[PDB]
Amino acid sequence: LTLQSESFQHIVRLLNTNVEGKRKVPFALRMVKGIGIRFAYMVCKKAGVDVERRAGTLSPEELEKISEVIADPAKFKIPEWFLNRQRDPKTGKTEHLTSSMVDTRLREDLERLRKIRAHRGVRHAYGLRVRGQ
Amino acid sequence: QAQVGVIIKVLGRTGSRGNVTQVRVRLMANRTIVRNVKGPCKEGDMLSLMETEREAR
Amino acid sequence: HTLKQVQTFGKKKTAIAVATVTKAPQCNIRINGVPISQILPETLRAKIMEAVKVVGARYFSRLRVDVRVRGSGQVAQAYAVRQAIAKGIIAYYQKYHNEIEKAALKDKYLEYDKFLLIADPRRCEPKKWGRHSARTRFTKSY
Amino acid sequence: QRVLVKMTSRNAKAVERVVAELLEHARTEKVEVRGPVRLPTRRLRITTRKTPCGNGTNTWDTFEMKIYKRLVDLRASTELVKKITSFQIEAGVDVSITIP
Amino acid sequence: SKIRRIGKKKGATLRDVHPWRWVKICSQHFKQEGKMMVPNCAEIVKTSHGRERAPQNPDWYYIRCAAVLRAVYLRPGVGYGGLSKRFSSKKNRGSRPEITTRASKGLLHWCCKSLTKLELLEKCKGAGHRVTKLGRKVADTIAFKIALR
Amino acid sequence: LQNAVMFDKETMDKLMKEVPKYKVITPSIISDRLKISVALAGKGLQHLCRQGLIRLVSCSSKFRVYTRAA
Amino acid sequence: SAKAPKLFNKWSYENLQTTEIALNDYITRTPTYVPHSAGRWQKKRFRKARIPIVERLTNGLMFKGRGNGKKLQAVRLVRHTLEIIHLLTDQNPIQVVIDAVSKGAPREDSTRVRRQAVDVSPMRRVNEAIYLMCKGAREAAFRNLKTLPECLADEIVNASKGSSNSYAIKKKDEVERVAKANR
Amino acid sequence: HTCT
RNA sequence: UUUGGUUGAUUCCGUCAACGGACGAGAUCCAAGCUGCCCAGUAGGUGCCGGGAUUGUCCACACAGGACAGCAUCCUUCUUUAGGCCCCUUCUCUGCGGGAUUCCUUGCUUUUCGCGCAAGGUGAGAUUUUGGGCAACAGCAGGUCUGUGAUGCUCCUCAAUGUUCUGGGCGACACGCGCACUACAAUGUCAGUGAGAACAAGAGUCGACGCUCCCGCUUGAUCAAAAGAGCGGGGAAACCACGGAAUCACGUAGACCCACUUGGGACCGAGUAUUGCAAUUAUUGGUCGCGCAACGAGGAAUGUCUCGUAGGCGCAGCUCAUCAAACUGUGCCGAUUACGUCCCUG
Ligand SMILES: [K+]
Ligand SMILES: [K+]
Ligand SMILES: [K+]
Ligand SMILES: [K+]
Ligand SMILES: [K+]
Ligand SMILES: [Mg+2]
Ligand SMILES: [Mg+2]
Ligand SMILES: [Mg+2]
Ligand SMILES: [Mg+2]
Ligand code: NA
Ligand code: NA
Ligand code: NA
Ligand code: NA
Ligand code: NA
């Protein structure tokens, strides 16, 4: 029931993605590629941000605190099984990929299978379904 | 506007489909008339006739 | 020094409710442990409550009612309880009281609802092969 | 529960005959007999398509098989109980004598 | 006066009072006291794999333990297999028919451990857990507290 | 639909200025008279009932109905 | 002692009447506590006319593929509708429902027999009245913020007043006007 | 399998 | 063996160049709903006698807190997976039986009669009681030589169309058609608390001295799910089991508010555990991402259905070493319309 602060802003810019001024904080971070729900809840919990703030008052320090949490999730006691790339078939590292880096790794995987000339690679090249369907 | 009549007796189901029944109704004047009724109808029921001047055979 | 007790029962679909009515220092009605006036669905509370509200609470003055229900879902259990209660007071009043006092509450019961004293004989219909249920059939293609 | 005798078969008439005359064999000694108990009846059902080649309308076929079980409690000395249980048994009825 | 007592009927028991109100009061008592230990697994896990999202109530762990106390109170000798049945749901499986799933038995083990540490519950030999004398006293004292309120 | 999400002054004053005169008060209706979210309307109505300017008639988990106090 | 039953413990059945003498025998006003009956009302041809009027409105609410058989939900929706009606009208809610059913169905219809105008029996008048009210409210609350309990109250009130801003009344006029010119 |  | 009435009925009454008979319909059989005997250490209850917990002169009554029982009565209630005894068979179990017959009124019925109809009453049930099962005589060039140590003629028959092993395929996609599942959201989605079903199933008659099948309780746990491990039970009315199913309910002072959005979950990336001699063409289950894939209620056309039914919601069995959007059954919530006609199709 707090009055609008006149500093309320729309399309909050974060991680090179426009994030709606409305919507609760967990469901606004869901619009950043790689985060998704059930991860934005952990991000807000570990950044000390209430999940009932609706991005109306997201001061630059709070955005920076959020952005540094997602940058290194394991530094804030996020379990390894709670992550995007668990063991990285190429590098051999555990990390979380977000914000236009997941797509780059996706095209890296597709070309890696093509050079291998595995069955999954050739089916991807022809545009067919790679699972059993 | 509307005249209320009472159904005295029912002849039977008319029409090819059998969804229309034929009844004899007395106005409320003792003048009886013959009308076609749509829907489930019974003796002693009351209708609301818009015009009560023409027979329906 | 003396014990007054009756046992009745009622069934709706497959629920069986057994009610025990005895003389107690103060009236109490408990359904499966939790007392009445605490059953969460207010609609189902009204249906059970109407077993006493039709004849009035004066006839339930110092009677203790204990009911146990088993089987058949949620709504069907409420209906079995109200029937076992209604049959209970009538059975209790049949003895320990004159015949004129009885059949003065029965008419009030049967006027309001026949099922308050007579069980509903409806049961589920068996499924038959070649049908998705008792009645509906497999789709035809042409 | 001194002596438990359980009978079960596929013929209700045969089961009833064995129990009834087992009681008179008991009633001729003055044993202490707990009355016969009728355990729930069990039916085995098998459903199968009627056709041998998968053609026409899908018509099925439901078969059943009923099993009757009875229980009798006897409280008597062993060498005596064997004398009662030495009766002739109707065909198709099995009898199990157990002690708990 | 909704708190005026009828003739006789002194005191109260857990089975009498409204169930949700007792749980809410019991959960606050656990929180306000502070002896209950909450594991560091109580911020990431879901209640069951049949669920889709993590609990939205900040006091969900305190609420759950109070409910576990109530269930053991009602049914002595219950185990983790029984408690998973009590807390079930339907799982959304996509373009497939829904199916019912039980609560994870790992979390219920933690809930029983916290209650045992709070000497509110003890395990029967060769069976599940039952409630102790202190646990029975705690539940009934709160139930009478609500009736007077 | 351009419903507001946070209470603002002009709508803020209009909550105690015009709403209490209404004969029937519902979150669905209030969200129409003042261009606010239905979630916001329900909070504002609960705010007014605590103040005492309106009276709650029917209460339920999903539906609430309020009317003028006098 | 025993007191007269009151619907939802707030509304009384006493001093109720039907201004249309045609429908007087087909609208039931026996006092009840709740719209839940669970009786065999379809065994005989005319036995469905003995269901209390408030119950018939409850039955019509649960229609679509979602909602088939949700009687308890329908009772809750009906219950919240009555106070909105009572606040809007300052009159007994059951009286308003009785009036709306009376004036919500066309008294003259046209059927294919080239189409020729015919009459409408009392039972069909009551049935079609309730059917059009639920259908009008259900389509108004779809993809709308208004919600159903307060969508149904407005249309029932509008129908009782006879205003043309109602699905029931607007359809009734169109049917009657067509039947006139079709004869 | 694939249908389209 | 026709015509006149009646019946679901070639079911009956009457008439009659026909009279006597056989099948089919009806009856019989199974399962439900009401009841009688017999029943208990595998089903259940009632008193007391112990033991355990809470307990008010007023007063206080949720942060905003409301509507619905008990009070001329002998004494407040709950539990006993610290339990001893006494009385029992209403509820459960079921092998034979009773119970329904147009029985009783009123009105219609070929000129009477006869055969019978409709409304009501008795009643647990009131018209084949409700569901099934069985079902004649004639046929079809309907299907099956892929069930059999059912089989005639005719093919291959030792570098085989016999038999066995290794590896593939039966699943391949520009497309078209039948049948299902999931949705297009507020009568909703997500997160919590409450009460709560029936049908059922479970291991040896070849292999490790013991087991194989189905489950319960702990521990794993100073830290996910998924699992390894200890300890036991059940041959099944004794174990799983007080069978805590899902729709459902909640005055939860919960989250969202009309947008392809927290609606919908297709497609795809990475890590793990299990079944199996063997998982790539992903067996399966679980975790985090992708959600910018259509889809906003569907043209012509078209399927099923009349009371515990339609629709909605789950569970078990079967197939099964591992896989159910299928089928066979089971229960749970539970309606609108008609009680007609021969217009369409027969
Ligand atoms: K088919
Ligand atoms: K023929
Ligand atoms: K195939
Ligand atoms: K199949
Ligand atoms: K025809
Ligand atoms: Mg001939
Ligand atoms: Mg051929
Ligand atoms: Mg979703
Ligand atoms: Mg979306
Ligand atoms: Na869904
Ligand atoms: Na579904
Ligand atoms: Na709506
Ligand atoms: Na006929
Ligand atoms: Na051959």
PDB file of C-alpha atoms (C1' of nucleotides) in Angstrom, chain A residues 27 37-38 41 45 52, chain E residues 20 42 44-61 63-64 87-93 98-99 101 103 107, chain F residues 61-62, chain I residues 188-194 246-256 262-264 287-288:
ATOM      1  CA  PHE A  27       8.776 -13.624 -12.408  1.00  0.00           C
ATOM      2  CA  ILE A  37      11.416 -20.035 -12.390  1.00  0.00           C
ATOM      3  CA  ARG A  38      12.598 -22.100  -9.397  1.00  0.00           C
ATOM      4  CA  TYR A  41      13.358 -17.760  -6.238  1.00  0.00           C
ATOM      5  CA  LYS A  45      16.551 -15.506  -1.422  1.00  0.00           C
ATOM      6  CA  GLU A  52       6.958  -9.263  -2.939  1.00  0.00           C
TER       7      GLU A  52
ATOM      8  CA  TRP E  20      -6.058 -24.939  11.041  1.00  0.00           C
ATOM      9  CA  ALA E  42      15.064 -25.997   3.924  1.00  0.00           C
ATOM     10  CA  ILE E  44      16.167 -25.373  -2.013  1.00  0.00           C
ATOM     11  CA  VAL E  45      14.143 -28.584  -1.811  1.00  0.00           C
ATOM     12  CA  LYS E  46      10.513 -29.066  -2.761  1.00  0.00           C
ATOM     13  CA  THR E  47       8.050 -30.912  -0.552  1.00  0.00           C
ATOM     14  CA  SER E  48       7.846 -33.740  -3.094  1.00  0.00           C
ATOM     15  CA  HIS E  49       9.021 -34.462  -6.612  1.00  0.00           C
ATOM     16  CA  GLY E  50       5.357 -34.466  -7.625  1.00  0.00           C
ATOM     17  CA  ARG E  51       5.195 -30.769  -6.802  1.00  0.00           C
ATOM     18  CA  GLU E  52       6.338 -28.155  -9.297  1.00  0.00           C
ATOM     19  CA  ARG E  53       7.619 -25.214  -7.224  1.00  0.00           C
ATOM     20  CA  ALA E  54       9.187 -24.617  -3.829  1.00  0.00           C
ATOM     21  CA  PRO E  55       6.915 -23.591  -0.930  1.00  0.00           C
ATOM     22  CA  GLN E  56       5.770 -19.972  -0.921  1.00  0.00           C
ATOM     23  CA  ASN E  57       5.315 -19.685   2.856  1.00  0.00           C
ATOM     24  CA  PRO E  58       8.455 -18.442   4.664  1.00  0.00           C
ATOM     25  CA  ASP E  59       7.421 -20.382   7.792  1.00  0.00           C
ATOM     26  CA  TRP E  60       6.691 -23.579   5.868  1.00  0.00           C
ATOM     27  CA  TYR E  61       9.111 -25.728   7.866  1.00  0.00           C
ATOM     28  CA  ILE E  63       4.098 -25.249   9.804  1.00  0.00           C
ATOM     29  CA  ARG E  64       5.003 -28.725   8.535  1.00  0.00           C
ATOM     30  CA  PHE E  87       0.813 -35.398   2.307  1.00  0.00           C
ATOM     31  CA  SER E  88       0.156 -36.257  -1.342  1.00  0.00           C
ATOM     32  CA  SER E  89      -0.763 -34.444  -4.540  1.00  0.00           C
ATOM     33  CA  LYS E  90      -1.300 -34.883  -8.275  1.00  0.00           C
ATOM     34  CA  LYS E  91       1.644 -34.405 -10.633  1.00  0.00           C
ATOM     35  CA  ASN E  92       1.360 -32.601 -13.967  1.00  0.00           C
ATOM     36  CA  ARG E  93       3.143 -34.825 -16.489  1.00  0.00           C
ATOM     37  CA  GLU E  98      -2.049 -37.062 -14.272  1.00  0.00           C
ATOM     38  CA  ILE E  99      -0.805 -39.371 -11.518  1.00  0.00           C
ATOM     39  CA  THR E 101       2.680 -38.986  -5.969  1.00  0.00           C
ATOM     40  CA  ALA E 103       5.696 -36.776  -0.310  1.00  0.00           C
ATOM     41  CA  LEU E 107      12.047 -34.491   4.559  1.00  0.00           C
TER      42      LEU E 107
ATOM     43  CA  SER F  61     -11.376 -17.274   0.475  1.00  0.00           C
ATOM     44  CA  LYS F  62     -12.010 -16.329  -3.163  1.00  0.00           C
TER      45      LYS F  62
ATOM     46  C1'   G I 188      -8.724 -20.424 -13.108  1.00  0.00           C
ATOM     47  C1'   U I 189      -3.000 -21.515 -12.186  1.00  0.00           C
ATOM     48  C1'   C I 190       0.546 -22.084  -7.961  1.00  0.00           C
ATOM     49  C1'   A I 191       1.670 -23.074  -2.332  1.00  0.00           C
ATOM     50  C1'   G I 192      -0.223 -24.906   2.188  1.00  0.00           C
ATOM     51  C1'   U I 193      -4.045 -27.347   6.009  1.00  0.00           C
ATOM     52  C1'   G I 194      -8.747 -31.140   6.565  1.00  0.00           C
ATOM     53  C1'   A I 246      -8.106 -37.991  -7.105  1.00  0.00           C
ATOM     54  C1'   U I 247     -12.082 -34.672  -8.127  1.00  0.00           C
ATOM     55  C1'   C I 248     -13.460 -31.990  -3.128  1.00  0.00           C
ATOM     56  C1'   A I 249     -13.291 -28.529   1.196  1.00  0.00           C
ATOM     57  C1'   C I 250     -10.914 -24.239   3.891  1.00  0.00           C
ATOM     58  C1'   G I 251     -13.295 -16.563   7.552  1.00  0.00           C
ATOM     59  C1'   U I 252      -5.920 -19.803   4.210  1.00  0.00           C
ATOM     60  C1'   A I 253      -7.863 -12.183   6.445  1.00  0.00           C
ATOM     61  C1'   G I 254      -1.985 -16.860   0.973  1.00  0.00           C
ATOM     62  C1'   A I 255       0.550 -15.347  -4.302  1.00  0.00           C
ATOM     63  C1'   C I 256      -1.284 -13.678  -9.614  1.00  0.00           C
ATOM     64  C1'   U I 262       2.658 -17.628 -13.072  1.00  0.00           C
ATOM     65  C1'   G I 263      -2.359 -20.064 -19.132  1.00  0.00           C
ATOM     66  C1'   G I 264       0.066 -24.781 -22.568  1.00  0.00           C
ATOM     67  C1'   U I 287      17.451 -32.421 -11.397  1.00  0.00           C
ATOM     68  C1'   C I 288      18.507 -27.564 -13.622  1.00  0.00           C
TER      69        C I 288
END
